[PDB]
Symmetry: D2
Subunit: 388 residues, 4 copies
């Protein structure tokens, strides 16, 4: 009577997630390295729809052209053998010491050019393996101190970099779009474009804004104590939710990348509620790290859980929305009134309307309860499976 | 040998700041109410350039037309008697119980209309007393629970409201522009447009974006653990820093509104550094609360401090920038390289350049120190007055 | 097929909770004042076991002796009419302006004496109405700035105050014990004894430590980003959990006092799990505020929810613990090994044991998976009612 | 006219600080490994008083007895050649994969025994090289999920471990004491004894509490948003500040370990103020990481800065305390009254005193300003070197 995921649920996983070897700021790897081909096979057996990669996840840094060929072909045969897809890809511009002050916004001009060139090389690959989205996570763009980075110049260089990528893309006639992934900090003291809001606003300054959107991560917005569903709704309102990274985070601290459903469970529910009601049809991508306490059996247990919790949440939110008792409470709370225009009649009519000011009875309106706590308990009940 | 502010330094204060009576979530007022005319007189003696107001700060809620006249005239005579200006004004849409679920985004349609009408009434007043900026702080737009607010509808209503304001403004031919002030939370559990980034991005969806910018507050961005100078630089890059609210905050907790210079002192320094180097020429506005421990003597002490700390900071940052030893370190750290274009030569040339990839020596570039810690200690030394 | 609470579940509520009139830092009351007698009657109908009070909640500040009599008698008749008890009481030393720099640790000596005297007066009352626990929440003990409070002197005055209370208590031969409630901040910038840990440690310096324990609040520890069940377990290990305050909080920000089950739901589950397994038999006390959006109907809805969520949680945690599949996983994860002594054999034997160092195979032990993610998903499944 | 540190200032540094190779959760080392003997020599030239070590910092894990000899002797010759001391030492129980679920509180009994044995081996070494303090940082004691760790059992095992260490120590007749270092999180999701308060309270449950105190770190308390000087004062009041770790942290996020003076500058000032006024005579130990952006020249620049900022702070705080204008303001704010007993006259006299309640004029006392903002601006002025 369960929640088994199928490739139609569009669940994806990054190679670096289940492949995380468990090295952290204070300790060595607890797990041996996984061959990408094993990961593809194991995730498919679990019902994943596909996998995503960093260039250096697939092809080890410094690899020879003929080594590149080998890594790709082998990866290609695994994806052919399993039906798995590659909907998204990204570049690693944060691990190698050369990127210690950034990729696109490093102070050293020659480093910024190298970063562009390593990114462009990987977009051709990504296109080849059929990704539709290309993610950019500028984890090293930022600073630990105020004098080290002039942020107006850094944003000029960031825009310069995204504009060049967009020009490259259109000239090759590729179908791919870009998704910028925000993070407020870690590993830099502060990171540029630290939240969904910052990312959306930056995009509006680009040459061809239509090529760019956001890839928000649950844990990253929560590292700034923000409401993630609220941020996702602003991205949907803007037509910019191109991709999404799902995981768990317990409040404001280091980036935990726990399995989805872990961390803020109610946030999880409201997010699924929103993705499902808006009709989000992009990949459901997990960016998570199975804790370093675990062996390979716990890794696959943790990955399976990501998908299971999504499905359970999905069922509980459908039940909530469909419940006649909840639809009535939503009317009681005037959500229906929220969706009607405030002044369709227009400015002039508003100004002339005595019932909107001069004869508005503020005190009776003030007295009206919103009935939000009864509504939220109905949501609680539905989440916990305790309606009655 | 001091730091006395003058009206030319453009220091402003809200009526509600020095007038804060010290009521907080857990306690009654510790200070008696101040007459606006006394505040204008006292701030001018301290060297303030002007004052700002909420409608209900100036004219008590429910005031009769002929009472309105009285409050304004008296306020007018004080400003004539002192040379003080009114560069900014705003509406109170958060105190009255009718706004408990919001103003522009309340679920109740009739409340949203009332809010527009109370705002429009105050823009005419503001214009009359000569403000150039009209601030909007939607402190009650948001929610404590997920079902209570559909955020896509709420953003449709928020835009609807700002568009109507903009239409009103152009039709009256007024010279005023709008500044939206972000806050992540408090008094609502979560607030819509919670940071500078969110606010800038929303503005790009408005009918006439040129009429709107942001009024960021030091403490509000810091309630989300963000880097405030970094946020201010993004607002400057976007040409949207219309106004700014200065104060102090000690990390992530309730909105403290401490006097400017309190809270994160180094953040204070880097901010002044930035406003001064960008050539910000708007008002230097303090949104602060003298702690409720204080009597009227401590109130004026706390207001004088706001201005004093700005000036001290201003002197230390000029000294830093002007220091030949610092200019050399900035070169050492390649800030000069940050401000040059990455690929002025263009995409094609970048792709063809072997020195940007194929023959790029990553390891030598990796080996180059950024020299940021020596630079930051020089900044430290300058701040503390300990160069040597 | 529900979760109806009964007086045997020991659910209590403070007069100030359902009576909260909804005044917050930025807005007026949205609800009229409740007569304590109405609250007692309404909570009893909901199945509460009892109520708790601040002195000034029951008897308005400045009340005449003969007014005191009136308030008490009336309150007494309501408790007789309903079977409701008064297990806990406390003093208000934070609302009146005289306490603006604190009660027990105010800088002014005469204020500290007044605070003691107002507290002692209320302990006699509390005893009279039969409370067994007397809570102290020093919300005003602390500071906004470093020079204002010497913390070593303030702790000497705090101890002095608790020692005097303890002497008073023993000399009257009263049966009551003290519970100190920690809070990290708000309304002061920083508050003394900011967490459970600080409170427990302070208590060990008192004259008669056995008279004092802690009354931790869910939201307060979470305002410091701490793990509340973890803090509660340390209090239980110390034999100091005298009382507990239950509510909801969404991470690090202002003190929300949401209804219990709101905020961190998984934290809620693990807490109930712990109170239930340790055999906590004290009151289940809610310190919450029905949001100011609500009318009286939402108030009682919100209070009923506190109790309902506890019961649902209670059922899910019993189910988890009782599940044979979970008991096996706990063995898989070696929780059984955690509860056995490390070196019962003693130091000498440990030192001599070659299998503990010299011939310990670190690499095989390193290879052993902890199996925590499978265990946590079983916990997830149980919480959500989705075992299968 | 400078701030050159001397060995008499008692400045110490851990081998792992300047030796940090800059590997972080998202990137490889940017610096080559330093030989401990080079570090000792370089720090001495900078005026350090001594160095501290983890066992595995000095002697590489798995080292043969005869390799141990070699590492020690060489280290010994460097300390003889420079006059440098070793006031503190500690054990690494967090890096090796065997410690992934902890050292003293790992679920696996055999791991807990190994951890004790590796710790005891290093105490003999520490004693030999003359340390007086032995630090314990249980960075791996804790959990990512609720079921994984029963905290009451874990505290029983933690106590068991510290008691055994204490027994070992007394039986060998060693002069060394223990200092427990708290951290709220990272690398575990939550860490046991997460703050100074928790650590002090735990210690009171040990067999011989006099052997144990705390080694608080500036950044760790600030990761929980706490006031560090306030925590240090509670540790001093308790007579438990055995050692202290100095560094910088920018609010609530990952453990930054910035150079001392970085992060919260005003917190830095008030801390130095307190250590200096209490007469703290222990080592001034820096636990910091030169950012991975830096080369060896920036490493020594960053270490020199730690010491320089302490000295500058030290001078500014002495100036503040010594200033007649500040001594008067302190009287104005009644700090003198804070240090007098509240009721030396005793309970009975307090109860009988009509001036403490019955005839106490609350309203006049309420009216008295605390004058804290003038005092704090005088502190500001002194810090910035702008008195006038």
């Amino acid at each position: 009577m369960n929640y088994q995921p199928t490739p139609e649920d569009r669940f994806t996983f990054g190679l670096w997630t289940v492949g995380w070897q468990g090295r952290d700021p204070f300790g060595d790897a607890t797990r041996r390295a996984l061959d990408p081909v094993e990961s593809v096979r194991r995730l498919a057996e679990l019902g994943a729809h596909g996998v995503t990669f960093h260039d250096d996840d697939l092809i080890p840094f410094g690899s020879s052209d003929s080594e590149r060929e080998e890594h790709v072909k082998r990866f290609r045969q695994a994806l052919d053998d399993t039906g798995m897809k590659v909907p998204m890809a990204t570049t690693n511009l944060f691990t190698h010491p050369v990127f210690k002050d950034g990729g696109f916004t490093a102070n050293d001009r020659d480093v910024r050019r190298y970063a562009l060139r390593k990114t462009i090389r990987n977009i051709d690959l990504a296109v080849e393996l059929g990704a539709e989205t290309y993610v950019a996570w500028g984890g090293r763009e930022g600073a630990e101190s105020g004098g080290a980075k002039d942020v107006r110049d850094a944003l000029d260089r960031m825009k310069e970099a995204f504009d060049l990528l967009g020009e490259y893309v259109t000239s090759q006639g590729y179908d791919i779009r870009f998704a910028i992934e925000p993070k407020p900090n870690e590993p830099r003291g502060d990171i540029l474009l630290p939240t969904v809001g910052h990312a959306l606003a930056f995009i509006e300054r680009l040459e061809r804004p239509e090529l760019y959107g956001v890839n928000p991560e649950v844990g990253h917005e929560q590292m700034a104590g923000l409401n993630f569903p609220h941020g996702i709704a602003q991205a949907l309102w803007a037509g910019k939710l191109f991709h999404i990274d799902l995981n768990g985070q317990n409040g404001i601290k280091y980036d935990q990348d726990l399995r989805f459903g872990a961390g803020d469970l109610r946030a999880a529910f409201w997010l699924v509620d929103l993705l499902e009601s808006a009709g989000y049809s992009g990949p459901r991508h997990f960016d998570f790290k199975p804790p370093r306490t675990e062996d390979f059996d716990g890794v696959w247990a943790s990955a399976a859980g990501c998908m299971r919790n999504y499905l359970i949440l999905k069922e509980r939110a459908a039940a909530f929305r469909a419940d006649p008792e909840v639809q009535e409470a939503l009317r009681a709370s005037r959500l229906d009134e929220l969706a009607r225009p405030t002044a369709a009649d227009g400015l002039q009519a508003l100004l002339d309307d005595r019932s909107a000011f001069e004869e508005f009875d503020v005190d009776a309106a003030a007295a009206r309860g919103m009935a939000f706590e009864r509504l939220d308990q109905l949501a609680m009940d539905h989440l916990l499976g305790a309606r009655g």
